[PDB]
Amino acid sequence: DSCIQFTRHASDVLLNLNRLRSRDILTDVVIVVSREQFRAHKTVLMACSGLFYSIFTDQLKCNLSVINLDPEINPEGFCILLDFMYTSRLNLREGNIMAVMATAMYLQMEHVVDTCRKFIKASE
Amino acid sequence: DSCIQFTRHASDVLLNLNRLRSRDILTDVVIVVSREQFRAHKTVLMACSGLFYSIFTDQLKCNLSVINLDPEINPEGFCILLDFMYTSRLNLREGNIMAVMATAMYLQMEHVVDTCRKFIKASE
Amino acid sequence: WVIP
Amino acid sequence: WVIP
Numbered sequence A, B: 001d002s003c004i005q006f007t008r009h010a011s012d013v014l015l016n017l018n019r020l021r022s023r024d025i026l027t028d029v030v031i032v033v034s035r036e037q038f039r040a041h042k043t044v045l046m047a048c049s050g051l052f053y054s055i056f057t058d059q060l061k062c063n064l065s066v067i068n069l070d071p072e073i074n075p076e077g078f079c080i081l082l083d084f085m086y087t088s089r090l091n092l093r094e095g096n097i098m099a100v101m102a103t104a105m106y107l108q109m110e111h112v113v114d115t116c117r118k119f120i121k122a123s124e
Numbered sequence C, D: 001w002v003i004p
């Protein structure tokens, strides 16, 4: 086509979606990870994770307001990944890399799994 | 912080939100523009437009499944802007620039209004 | 704004 | 991935 493009548009959209998350505006699901609860937007979770995409396209699960993750999932690893979904920034540290990689594999977040594998390979 | 950032994340998120729009997945509002209807995600509309941000943060309007725009609004101008919200690409043409600018002013989409004003000033 |  |  003959379209023009606004370079910062996608970043500005995600920044605003994160502002809605911070003020708990139009969040429509609770993700339960052991004793912790995380409120989020189903559409953002689907756009970032192959697992949430599969969950919320299911004719029964699409209507659930609460989703319980596998008990092996670490709440801190989930929190770091939820922050990444809404910001593009990943808080990857020596102390959390194993939990973050395991959580990204479960959530089906291929680019996160890839950088974790590379950071682990560098330290061996 | 000591975060790493995935450059393409925001663009990839918006691309997936547009795929959900195209398949009508988890759309939660109809925008009525004269005889035309446009299905969308409330969160994306709020993230792109000062008018939708004001509408869906209102305690009564946040619950509406149908929003009727002012009858002066052109459905084609709205369609072009809805496409821009989900893609960052604006189909700006000599034949539609006036309707697009009027619609972006009404929707409170400052960056679109700015490029329309510049393209109009160049042709005078 | 750019030409994509 | 980059250093932001």
Ligand SMILES: O=C1Cc2cc(Nc3nc(Cl)ncc3Br)ccc2N1
Residues within 6 Å of the ligand: A046, A047, A048, A049, A050, A051, A053, A108, A109, A110, A111, B016, B017, B019, B020
């Ligand atoms: O690593 C990842 C990230 C991701 C996101 C989605 N999400 C969507 N995919 C498609 Cl094709 N359409 C709409 C949506 Br929402 C699917 C798979 C994966 N795997």
Ligand SMILES: O=C1Cc2cc(Nc3nc(Cl)ncc3Br)ccc2N1
Residues within 6 Å of the ligand: A016, A017, A019, A020, B046, B047, B048, B049, B050, B051, B053, B108, B109, B110, B111
């Ligand atoms: O030209 C524009 C585009 C735009 C978007 C929003 N959206 C939001 N703004 C804030 Cl501060 N927080 C969350 C959201 Br969603 C508000 C105003 C404007 N004006």
Ligand SMILES: [Cl-]
Residues within 6 Å of the ligand: A048, A109, A110, A111, A112, A113
């Ligand atoms: Cl990813």
Ligand SMILES: [Cl-]
Residues within 6 Å of the ligand: B048, B109, B110, B111, B112, B113
């Ligand atoms: Cl804009």
